[PDB]
């Protein structure tokens, strides 16, 4: 389980919101770690998987598995808080500096994006 990874994910969000780090270089690292974490959590699965899980829950006929959905929910809560704060930081940042760090931050924004889509 990438539970241990979860803690790093939290630290990353913390640093970003704080926007400490004179270096965007630092923030690029934070963005990269977050990107992998978001991607890692949902191994490529598509709506079919979600539908199957819901049915199984169907209702807990017996013992269901709803592990991946639960993991996504926890990620999304953490992310929310930290989120408003950090969204501000991530976008402004965007522009400038780092045309570089950019490659990293835009990718982070897009992954995040699916999840927390909605």
């Amino acid at each position: 389980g990438d539970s241990s990874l979860y803690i790093i994910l939290k630290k990353l969000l913390d640093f970003i919101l704080k926007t400490g780090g004179g270096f965007q270089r630092v923030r690029t690292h934070l963005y990269g770690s977050l990107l992998y974490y978001l991607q890692i959590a949902q191994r490529p699965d598509e709506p079919d998987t979600l539908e199957a899980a819901k049915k199984t829950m169907w209702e807990r006929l017996t013992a269901p598995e709803d592990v991946f959905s639960k993991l996504q929910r926890e990620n999304i809560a953490i992310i929310e808080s930290y989120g408003a704060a950090l969204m501000e930081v991530v976008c402004r940042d965007a522009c400038d500096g780092h045309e570089i760090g950019r490659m990293l931050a835009l990718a982070l924004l897009d992954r995040i994006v699916s999840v927390d889509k909605q």
């Binding site: 199957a52 049915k55 199984t56 169907w58 807990r60 013992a63 269901p64 598995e65 592990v67």
Partner: protein, 137 residues
């Protein structure tokens, strides 16, 4: 598409022939229409020919190529399907054991009695084991 690619041979000579082969190979790959293009289900009785097979020949090498690629992507099912055509029976079961093995461990509420990896498991066993089974014990 296959019908059109086949015309390429109409210009008889090497080069064109390879171009044809490459085109078909390219078609199979990325279209991923394996059943249609390559073939399907044994029920003993080898392959039921795919459209290309009707045209014929290099088909085994293409399968290995596609199957390996499936492995990269991790498109299991496609790999199993491809290996069946490849007739690598041992490989099929092994990939198969892996697929069934996970999905077994997990949490409960599943397994309708009609279709999936388990069902897939049933198909292969009934299918191969009775017949001159080439797989490892």
């Amino acid at each position: 598409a296959l019908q059109y690619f086949y015309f390429l041979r109409d210009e008889k000579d090497s080069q064109g022939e390879n171009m044809f082969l490459r085109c078909v190979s390219e078609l199979v790959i990325e279209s991923r229409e394996f059943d249609m293009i390559l073939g399907k289900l044994e029920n003993d009785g080898s392959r039921k020919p795919g459209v290309i097979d009707k045209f014929t020949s290099d088909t085994k090498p293409i399968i290995n190529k596609v199957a390996s690629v499936a492995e990269n992507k991790g498109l299991f099912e496609e790999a199993a399907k491809l290996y069946d055509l490849a007739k690598n029976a041992d490989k099929v079961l092994e990939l198969m054991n892996k697929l069934l093995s996970p999905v077994v461990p997990q949490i409960s509420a599943p397994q309708s009695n009609k279709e999936r990896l388990k069902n897939m498991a049933l198909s292969i066993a009934e299918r191969y084991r009775a017949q001159g089974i080439s797989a490892n014990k």
